[PDB]
Design a protein around this ligand. Structure first.
Ligand SMILES: *[C@@H]1O[C@H](CO)[C@@H](O[C@@H]2O[C@H](CO)[C@@H](O)[C@H](O)[C@H]2NC(C)=O)[C@H](O)[C@H]1NC(C)=O
Ligand SMILES: *[C@@H]1O[C@H](CO)[C@@H](O[C@@H]2O[C@H](CO)[C@@H](O)[C@H](O)[C@H]2NC(C)=O)[C@H](O)[C@H]1NC(C)=O
Length: 209
């Protein structure tokens, strides 16, 4: 069989967390250890699987999400934290095994370029018709924030805010968001989210033996 193609991850400027890029793999062979050996891995944690198991099992699919992400914001990735990252930007499946990897890009990994800064959504909210009540708009597993329609791929200025008037068909009211920025680090720091699914006789994403 053919090798899983991880090259988009290694090519060009990775998106910000709320614009995470998604790679989907079926029917291919992988070597996770080899992929990760290109990076300096700072954190590698999983739910319903382990770092050793995720590198050595056969799956019906493997999903890999990737983005620029400052290591300083480690804690904001957890569901248990009610931080803006897990609330408004990026959420992994709660029903399939997952891993989250935080890594630093070495200088000798040249095909990856730095963005100007890190950006994230600090707030995504709906104003109701009473013009008073704001309802947080929590990102769903496997989806973008509804606010990706109004927040640009790079936040221009820390504290910028954004609104969209919604149609009766969309439930009326206003979608409202605010963006934050974090200074670029000496070396680019990234997050990788891996989600796996197991099937019956379709477990064809397998490690290189
Ligand atoms: C998958 O990739 C890993 C990492 O490149 C391979 O293990 C390394 O390669 C050689 C194998 O002779 C060892 O000497 C190193 O100590 C290993 N770790 C490194 C380089 O970090 C591994 O062989 C590959 N697995 C398969 C099944 O091909
Ligand atoms: C490219 O950069 C990598 C990433 O840091 C270098 O690998 C490191 O080498 C040092 C010692 O030389 C180790 O202590 C680190 O643990 C290594 N990093 C990783 C992620 O394994 C590597 O030496 C450089 N390679 C080239 C060809 O320049």
């Amino acid at each position: 069989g053919v090798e899983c193609d991880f090259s988009p991850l290694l090519s060009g400027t990775p998106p910000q967390v709320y614009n995470f890029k998604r790679l989907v793999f079926t029917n291919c062979n992988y070597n996770l250890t080899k992929l990760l050996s290109l990076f300096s891995v700072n954190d590698f944690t999983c739910s319903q699987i382990s770092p050793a198991a995720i590198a050595s099992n056969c799956y019906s699919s493997l999903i890999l999400d990737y983005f620029s992400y400052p290591l300083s914001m480690k804690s904001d990735l957890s569901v248990s934290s009610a931080g803006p990252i897990s609330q408004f930007n990026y959420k992994q499946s709660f029903s399939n095994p997952t891993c989250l990897i935080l890594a630093t890009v070495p200088h000798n990994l040249t095909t990856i370029t730095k963005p100007l800064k890190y950006s994230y959504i600090n707030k995504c909210s709906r104003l109701l018709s009473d013009d008073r009540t704001e309802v947080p708009q929590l990102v769903n597993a496997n989806q973008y924030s509804p606010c990706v329609s109004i927040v640009p791929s790079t936040v221009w200025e820390d504290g910028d805010y954004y609104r969209k008037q919604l149609s009766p068909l969309e439930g009326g009211g206003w979608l409202v968001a605010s963006g934050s920025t974090v200074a670029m680090t000496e070396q680019l720091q990234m997050g990788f989210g891996i989600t796996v699914q197991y099937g019956t006789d379709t477990n064809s994403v397998c490690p290189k033996l």
